[PDB]
Amino acid sequence: QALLRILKETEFKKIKVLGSGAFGTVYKGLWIPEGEKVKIPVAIKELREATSPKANKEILDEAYVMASVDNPHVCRLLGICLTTVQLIMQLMPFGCLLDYVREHKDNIGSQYLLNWCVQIAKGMNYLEDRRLVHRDLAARNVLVKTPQHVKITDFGLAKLLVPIKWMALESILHRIYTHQSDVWSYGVTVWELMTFGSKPYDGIPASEISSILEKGERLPQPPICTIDVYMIMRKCWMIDADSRPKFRELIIEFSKMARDPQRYLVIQGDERMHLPSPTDSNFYRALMDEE
Amino acid sequence: ALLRILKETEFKKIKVLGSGAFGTVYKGLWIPEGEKVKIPVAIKELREATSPKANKEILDEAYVMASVDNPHVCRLLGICLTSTVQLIMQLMPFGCLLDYVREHKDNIGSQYLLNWCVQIAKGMNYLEDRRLVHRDLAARNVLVKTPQHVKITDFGLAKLLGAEEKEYHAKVPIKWMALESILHRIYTHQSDVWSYGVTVWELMTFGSKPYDGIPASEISSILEKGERLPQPPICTIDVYMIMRKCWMIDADSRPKFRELIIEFSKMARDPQRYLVIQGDERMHLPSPTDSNFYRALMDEEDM
Ligand SMILES: CSc1nc(-c2ccnc(NC(C)=O)c2)c(-c2cccc(NC(=O)c3cccc4c3NC(=O)c3ccccc3N4)c2)[nH]1
């Protein structure tokens, strides 16, 4: 309850737009704490359709759970303004991972890609441990805090609100959403990362996707992926939800691959491709990522 | 690895924030190599050094400034050794504590004031434990990360830059320095406790100027004659007594920072018994909701 700060329209303002969607619009904004002469940058999501006070009470009820996620790889809702639903969180200068890997296409070392896989599996394992089903995991829903530090956002938004190309078969046919359907989605998100942001099933129309999944077609092996990595993606997309890896197992498998990334990803340029470096990491961290 | 050497090409000064005797502070933007993002930072471009020092001696002293690891001391993050010496640190949008107590004059609750004394003493007690001496502690060299959280800054810069001889009579923080330091240029952890006493007096007077109307060149003499700063109106004698012990001529009789931490922590637990402030019961103490929001937004540091 003290993890979510209820804001009033007069103590913050939107300053510039960053991104949009069906959900709502994303703004860089400024928080002006009462009685102070400072303007603190925030990110703000304004939802598309406002609604009644009864719907606001439902949103606030869910916002109290979102405010309670404490994990380095999941975004925490910080504040809310009920006008008309504005969600406030920490501003990330880097935007979303999908855009990041498109902008940096073919310029990303194997070390980063697998660390992002690890971190996203950690974030999803956390949600599962908290009994939260995301229902829309995708590269567009992972935000970049620093190139070394990514965070899942917008878990539960699909519920309070249709990405068919990311959904488990059982979720298309029967609107069944579990943590194991989130594992199917995780697999599509790793595919996104490994193709530097390609659209999944980019020909196929969404209404025909369930058809080809039953025929046993799956997204193809991305050029840079060794068979080891494509094996893991293919398990994420088995028909029997319970045959799919657990998020805890994905952390372990991807963590082992990230101790030797050039073995599992074959990337032209990789040896001299930028990695972390303790000096830069301390720097990013001290400047803007002390968590 | 604790200190990033920067090239001039990867940052830019954007707006000046304020000027001191040691240099001017700018808000600037870092641009990491290979990225299209601008990361806000603070840049202090240093004034000319009197002691004329080699680029390497600087580096050896910047590495020590980069090693301070404490919630209540600012760490040097990076350095540019070009035509000037430019220090890069994390941007503190609130500015310094001196400006802040001036701006919120008579609008600050005793719980805040005493908590700031705790945190500053915790900051100095860490530097003592590392066997480091600040030399220029003052309200102007305490930064506000959040109203709940202050940090000592500019550590090391007094050693770094030195001072011409004429500056010792008119820079040299004469009115904050122990008598030994003014006379013999001794600097110890106990002369730091003198500056801390003055710093505390700055806070309790909401930023008044110490010994206002006395020329700095005569501070020497009045201290020997036994004049000290007067009791600020909001201080009970408990608080004033501690400040007076900090200014004893005998450096060994002044309190230790570790003792100051306990004493002020105790006063912090019953703050209306030790500071008398009109309307203190209507002063904002920060609710857990508010503190959590500051911390998650701007202050994710350890404690
Ligand atoms: C995908 S695009 C994007 N980018 C950003 C962003 C953020 C920071 N910096 C940047 N920087 C740059 C340069 O772009 C961008 C944001 C954003 C901005 C503000 C807030 C939020 N999220 C939340 O509040 C939130 C947090 C947790 C879970 C959910 C959340 N939301 C919901 O609606 C929701 C509603 C009901 C039930 C569940 C929900 N789920 C997301 N969105």
Domain boundaries, chain B: 1-91, 92-289
Residue with CA closest to ligand 1 atom 12? A95
Q: b/e string for A198-223 if b means 16 or more Cβ within 10 A? A: eebbeeeeeeebeeebeeeebbebbe
User: Rounded to an integer, what is the distance from CA A130 to the centroid of its chain?
Assistant: 17
A180 lines ligand 1 (CB under 6 A): no
Dihedral, CA atoms, A159, A160, A164, A168, nearest 10 degrees?
-10
Q: How far apart are CA A119 and CA A122, in angstroms?
A: 5
| Residue in B with minimal Cα distance to A147 | B35
B34, B39, B103 ranked by CB distance to A288: nearest: B39
Q: Which residues contact A241 (CB under 8 A, 6 or more apart)?
A: A168, A170, A178, A180, A181, A183, A184
Q: Is the CB of A155 under 6 A from ligand 1?
A: yes
CB contact under 8 A, A3 and B290: no
Pocket test for ligand 1, best of A4, A44, A77 (most atoms within 8 A of CB): A77
Q: Which residue has the tokens 């790889």?
A: A73
Cβ atoms of B219 and B160 within 8 Å: the answer is: no
Report the chain B residue with the minimal C-alpha distance to residue A144: B37
Separation of CA A117 and ligand 1 centre (Å): 20
Alpha-carbon distance B232 to nearest alpha carbon in chain A (angstroms): 25
C-alpha triplet B14, B120, B252: angle, nearest 5°: 130
Instruction: Find chain A residues with C-beta within 8 A of B38's C-beta.
Output: 93
CA A18 to ligand 1: nearest atom: 14
Q: After which residues is chain A broken (C to N over 2.5 A)?
A: 83, 161
A109 CB near a chain B CB, below 8 Å?
A: no
Q: Are A37 and B103 in contact (CB < 8 Å)?
A: yes
**Does the annotation mark A70 as catalytic?**
no
Q: What is the experimental resolution, given in Å to one decimal place?
A: 2.2
Question: Which atom of ligand 1 is closest in space to residue A156's alpha carbon?
Answer: 38
In this structure, the number of other CB atoms found within 10 A of the CB of residue B236 comes to 14
Closest atom of ligand 1 to CA, residue A21: 2
Long-range CB contacts for residues A129-137, cutoff 8 Å, separation at least 24: A130/A69, A132/A65, A132/A69, A132/A156, A133/A177, A133/A178, A133/A179, A133/A181, A133/A182, A134/A182, A134/A185, A135/A159, A135/A171, A135/A177, A135/A181, A135/A182, A136/A163, A136/A166, A136/A185, A137/A166, A137/A182, A137/A185, A137/A186, A137/A189
A137 lines ligand 1 (CB under 6 A): no
Residue A225 per-residue DSSP state: B
Tokens describing residue B185:
């240029």
| Residues of A in Cβ contact (< 8 Å) with B302 | 290
CA quadruple A102, A103, A106, A112: dihedral sign: negative
Contact B297 A90 (CB under 8 A): yes
What Rg value do the Cα atoms of chain B yield, rounded? Answer: 19
For B41, the closest of A39, A78, A287 (CB atoms) is A287
Token code pair at residue A8: 């009033």
Containing A111, the helix (H) or strand (E) segment is helix A110-129
Q: Does A285 touch chain B (CB under 8 A)?
A: no
Q: For residues B13 and B26, what is the distance between their CA atoms, to the nearest angstrom?
A: 6
Domain spanning B92-289: CATH 3.40.50.300: no
If residue A255 lies in a helix (H) or strand (E), which one and from where to where? helix A247-258
Strand partners, A86: A46, A81
- What CATH superfamily classification does B1-91 receive? Phosphorylase Kinase; domain 1 (3.30.200.20)
Reading the block at residue B108, the tokens are 């600050």
What is the CATH T-level fold of the domain A92-279, as seen in this structure? Transferase(Phosphotransferase); domain 1 (1.10.510)
Q: Distance between terminal CA atoms of chain A?
A: 21
CA distance A261 to chain B (A): 21
CA of A154 to the centre of ligand 1 (A): 5
What technique determined this structure? X-ray
Name the one residue in this structure whose structure tokens are 């404690």. B303
Helix, strand, or coil (residue A30): strand
- Determine the Cα–Cα distance for residues B159 and B288; give it in Å rounded to an integer: 40
Q: How far apart are CA A88 and CA A77, in angstroms?
A: 6
Catalytic residue among B60, B106, B136, B252: B136
